[PDB]
């Protein structure tokens, strides 16, 4: 990629590709990149007691398309979930472009903005995976959901270990990298870059809920040719009665007792909480009594840590005054700012869809007997609240939405489980690789005599140009006997002003509400 | 199509080629394009009862070249409807190029402009023809009649449902169209475009009036061998006579009751008005009672539509007093403005010549009897004032002008009838593609911190180029044993200060009159 | 076709396979065949004064599957639906087999049955079309929607022509056809039948709403470069002004007045009634004054017959008050009986999506002037009640229903006008033939002494067996660059007893409502 400066180097693709079981969104998106941190590394760090943090903020930028809805237009997102059983990424090209550098000179008064030609922009892949990975944290920076929004790369900054829950104070393990440190490639108007990139072998997402209810897999007309202990007693009242040991064929109507073959999967009580404000406890924010203490989290080194996404789990509704961590909350239309007080304000999800198989969020798993019963004696009942893998269970993973994460790099550990992204997605052993862009420093006038001093003045530059994404999506049909027609993502907004997935009169593009993505149903 | 900066990427060809059958008219013009709604997309809507309507302004804009004039020179126009009975759009070739991007800065007291090499404009056909065609609604953007006016690129918006009479809210079946949901070229100076279409099989124009009447195509010399009743009395007086049944041989000099083979054609009565102001019945604009009331006209979905161009009808002549709808009226020379009350500021259509076959506008089709007549019952004589298609009607179309649109493009609809579009013109199904064209934003100085924010600050900017339009039309030369010396037409504008269809002292080019094609005859 | 007793003649198959652009539904449904007319064809006729009529009514019965659920299920009709904008047969294959016929022996009480082997029934197809169609008349007989219903054949009867309004008395013209006339084909168990079909190339039924509508298709940011009458007075008020010329640009804002090619397309007004039973006008039924004659109506030869499917054209909603003939009325799922009371008891159609093409039924098509205007004079404006084909009209059809016809036989007259079945369909010039189907009489003990009298006792019978048809339908995936999200047929049938779409506690299937087709959206 080289030719000269009247001379586009790249063009404008924002396709849509439907067949068989493959789909290729290709999408491009302008963008503009600062100069961050005015050119230098900085070392970051802040003891926050369980906040605590420390790490780097880096000179450079980053292009992220972590979010599903920088490819698929809303009508593509409901095409792809009203008529397939699942779908994953299966390769990825990115390509970078029309690069303009641009120098400004603030006038006595006033900016005013020139083109510096012969500036540089420096881009490079971090495809060894050599660098904490940024691109999965659920974080902003991806493109735009709408095609003609000019957006600001994000600015590249990474956390190493905290060792301790006190000082963000950093060991000799900590490390620092440094993006010069890399070979990257530079550029000029007429330069442009590209990649490409190729999904491992990864399982198709859900994109269905289920008809059967794993407690109710049999058939309901017959008897099982098992046995088990019916009542202790005779009576119906608890305690009371002739005592006997009364056994029974486990037939129909019964069902609760009926011997299975499978459990329900893992879990973990959340707290749950209402929407209407007085239904509550009043917690705090801060303070020794933060919210953070009484909701189940994890701990890592002494520090806390909100167990958020966490286990997949049955949850709430999307309309249900309760609602609870394990749900995803987005922005609304209307939210513009980082706090809010009217639930009604915000987006809410739900995997209320994972009642077949997986155990409520707020609930619990089950029961245990507290000890061992007796004729003198009848324990009490324990509460499973928290319960791992055991042989048998089964269960399905959480959702994903429109405006969710896409992919997510698993951890460089030995040794893990059923790894899928939490908050949702794909997990790649190595994803789609960082890509990294910053402009070049331009030295401004400098001293007329030798110092050994690192230079200071530099000219005040910011670059913008295209850049375009196309991923090949593999998707797969359904084919079920189901006679019944199905749900479907549809439209019913009923009347409206502005009509809704577009802009509205002032020209601002908002997102009304999530999508998700089990519409269709399989059974078990 | 690329190369260099100081390198022109298209020459300017303003052709005119003549020969048998086939001309090919080639023209360029230097255009400015503007930045469109500061550059984003705003949601159009307005409740007018009956002008209701809503939809969408874009950012982008568009060349349109469906106007007569933007092709054919007068001396050309008057060749090509002076020797030919016909003539047919058959291919298209436009290209755009020499483009030139600028950037301005107003000062502290007044603008000055510079030249942004580095910035791109982009470009693109709908020729898959999905998105709503504008190109063919009778509105302004066209090139300029006069090769060397400069002029400004149309700004691109559609119309969407109206559902009701009373409110502009849309509902689900509304559809918003992004035109960077499109793969579009992008082009910097030593770019430039380029595209062929070829035109569908269409019927030639007609280019000629009718001798003969649809009347009187019989032998004046002989007796048909058919009867009919010729009165049921004696007299001369109605209602009084000896009473008898009288059939005729319909013979000469009769005609009218001659048994013919076909019927005009379909009409639909429209209001004749007087420009002599005080002839008229003083009806107001707004209001209750506004003129459309009074006009005929049709009802979609509770809404009123002025029947404008309407059916083909003969008409009114563009001298008479007595003028109506079914009449193009186009601005006069010395008219500049969005109103006007003098008759001779405008200019006047006419169809006079459908007079042969057509019925005439403000008139009727015909009568009818209002009942059955009987020995004790002469009948209401009631007036055909609307009438539909009929076995045996045949009919000519509304004539085409030198200023008039070119084509249309037929509804997508399953079925229609007799697709000639009204306002004139060839109607096509797939008709010249739109092509859109916008300039690239640049976003200004940018904040030195992230910000998931779209961005605001773009540098101002506007581009300008030449773009040509070739087509190759194919026309038909007449070849009549007509012995008289046929109607043509000629200059005639007798002596003047600053010749016809010329600039005048000031510099301005100015239509005079408006040119018909039908100047040629053939018999029916 | 032809093996054994012991030997299954076919085999069961319900298939359904989707792809590309191509769907082939298979069903099979097993069916009795009884003794129809006693064995004998019997004159049919009935003077009823408008319902007179005329006839014969055979000894045989017929296949029918000119019903769309007999070959789609819920769950396919809704693929179908969601995603093409268009639809067609291309290819059947019907095949009836495992004939089974059976005799009964009503014994002193009560009825007992044995197979009669060697007994044979007759099957043959017109091909030649030469009998007068019965499938396409929008009545019962076809398949039942379920595949486990079984179902009984009906009988063919076919009407002559009915010379008056008065008598149901027959002409020499009147004809007498005699199935047994025909080459049939006889079977025995072990025998089959089996016949292949392909549609005639037919347009792809619409199955998609409009977005934009006919009289706002232009660009809402332009002024015409038309110029037409404003007002011809000064005020506000009607007859009250300075009285003048006011002619204007026709900019936008106005639009009802902007010159446009295209008109809504031909209409005939129909009379509106409400499901609310005291807002209407109280006619009778049977009487000099019944319903019909104050309902729009044709009159042939004398006789009165209601402008029932009609002309295509807009109409009321589902859930408005109002309805009217032009709206197909189904049987709801709890009612079963010739008549009703409750509207909520029935089913209800609706064209309203016609609104953005077609004039509305109950209201009219546009208005008139009643008379010429003058200064001295302000004409009555008249209604546009029914208008037949005009030069620039443009039109939808009549949507399709899960349980609508499918295709209709185009009447073997010297022209027509678009050809579409008005109950809706495709209209086919020689469309799938009419499978006939009857048992072959047995004669009982006969008469020891010769008898030139025709037979009389015969042994009592009826068949059944099972009949496959396998339809390959055409279909055409969308492809619009609309943004948002489409509207889409969904179960949303909320919380319910017994599910719904499926049989019920008592094993009955209904069907629940009625589905369209124009889920999707396409512009014009
Ligand atoms: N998103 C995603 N990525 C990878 N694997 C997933 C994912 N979702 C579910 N699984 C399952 C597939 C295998 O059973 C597995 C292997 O983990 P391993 O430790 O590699 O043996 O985890
Ligand atoms: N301008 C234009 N375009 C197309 N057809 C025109 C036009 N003017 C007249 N006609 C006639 C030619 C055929 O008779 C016809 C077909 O309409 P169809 O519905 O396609 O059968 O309409
Ligand atoms: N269902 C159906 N069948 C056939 N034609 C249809 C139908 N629907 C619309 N049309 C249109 C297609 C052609 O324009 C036409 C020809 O009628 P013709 O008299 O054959 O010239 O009618």
Chains 1, 2, 3 share one sequence.
């Not at 230098?40 to 906040?51: A, D, F, H, T, V």
């Not at 600015?155 to 070979?183: H, I, K, M, W």
């Not at 009364?246 to 499978?262: A, D, G, Q």
């Not at 269970?393 to 040794?415: C, E, F, L, S």
Request: glycine letters at 8%.
């Amino acid at each position: 990629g080289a030719d000269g400066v009247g001379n586009a180097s790249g063009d404008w693709h924002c396709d849509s590709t439907w067949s068989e079981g493959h789909v290729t969104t290709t999408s491009t998106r302008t963008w503009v990149l600062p100069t961050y941190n005015n050119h230098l590394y900085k070392r970051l760090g802040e003891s926050l007691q369980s906040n605590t943090y420390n790490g780097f903020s880096t000179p450079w930028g980053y292009f992220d398309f972590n979010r599903f809805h920088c490819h698929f237009s809303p009508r593509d997102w409901q095409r792809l979930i009203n008529n397939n059983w699942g779908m994953r990424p299966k390769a990825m090209r990115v390509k970078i472009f029309n690069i303009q550098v641009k120098e400004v000179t603030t006038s006595n008064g006033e900016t005013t903005v020139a083109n510096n030609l012969t500036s540089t922009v420096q881009i490079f892949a971090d495809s060894s995976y050599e660098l904490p990975y940024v691109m999965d944290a659920g974080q902003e920076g991806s493109l735009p959901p709408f095609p003609n929004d000019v957006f600001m790369v994000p600015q590249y900054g990474y956390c190493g270990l905290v060792t301790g829950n006190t000082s963000q104070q950093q060991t000799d393990r900590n490390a620092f990298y440094c993006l010069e440190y890399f070979p990257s490639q530079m550029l000029r108007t007429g330069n442009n870059f590209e990649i490409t990139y190729s999904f491992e072998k990864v399982p198709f997402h859900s994109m269905y809920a289920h008809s059967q209810s794993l407690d109710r897999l049999m058939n309901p007309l017959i008897d099982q040719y098992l046995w088990g202990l019916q009542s202790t007693t005779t009576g119906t009242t608890l305690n009371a009665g002739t005592a006997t040991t009364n056994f029974t064929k486990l037939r129909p109507t019964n069902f609760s007792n009926f011997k299975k073959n499978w459990l329900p999967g893992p879990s973990i009580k959340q707290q749950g909480f209402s929407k209407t404000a007085n239904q509550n406890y009043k917690i705090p924010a801060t303070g020794s009594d933060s919210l953070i203490k009484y909701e189940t989290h994890s701990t890592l080194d002494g520090r806390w840590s909100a167990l958020t996404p966490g286990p997949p789990m049955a949850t709430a509704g999307p309309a249900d005054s309760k609602f609870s961590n394990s749900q995803l909350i987005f922005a609304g239309p209307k939210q513009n700012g980082n706090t809010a007080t009217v639930p009604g304000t915000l987006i809410f999800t739900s995997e209320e869809e994972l009642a077949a198989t997986n155990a409520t969020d707020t609930d619990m798993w089950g029961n245990l007997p507290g000890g061992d019963q007796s004729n003198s004696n009848l324990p009490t009942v324990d509460r499973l609240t928290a319960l791992g893998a055991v042989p048998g269970m089964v269960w399905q993973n959480r959702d994903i939405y429109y405006q969710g994460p896409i992919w997510a790099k698993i951890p460089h550990t030995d040794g893990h489980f059923h790894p899928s992204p939490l908050i949702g997605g794909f997990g790649l052993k190595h994803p789609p690789p960082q890509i990294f862009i910053k402009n070049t420093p331009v030295p401004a006038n400098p001293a007329t005599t030798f110092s050994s001093t690192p230079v200071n003045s530099f000219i005040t530059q910011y670059s913008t140009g295209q850049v375009s994404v196309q991923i090949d999506w593999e998707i797969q049909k359904e084919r079920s006997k189901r006679w019944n027609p199905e749900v479907q993502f549809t439209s019913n907004y009923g009347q409206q002003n502005s009509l809704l997935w577009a802009p509205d009169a002032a020209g601002k593009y908002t997102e009304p509400r999530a999508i998700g993505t089990r519409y269709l149903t399989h059974h078990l």
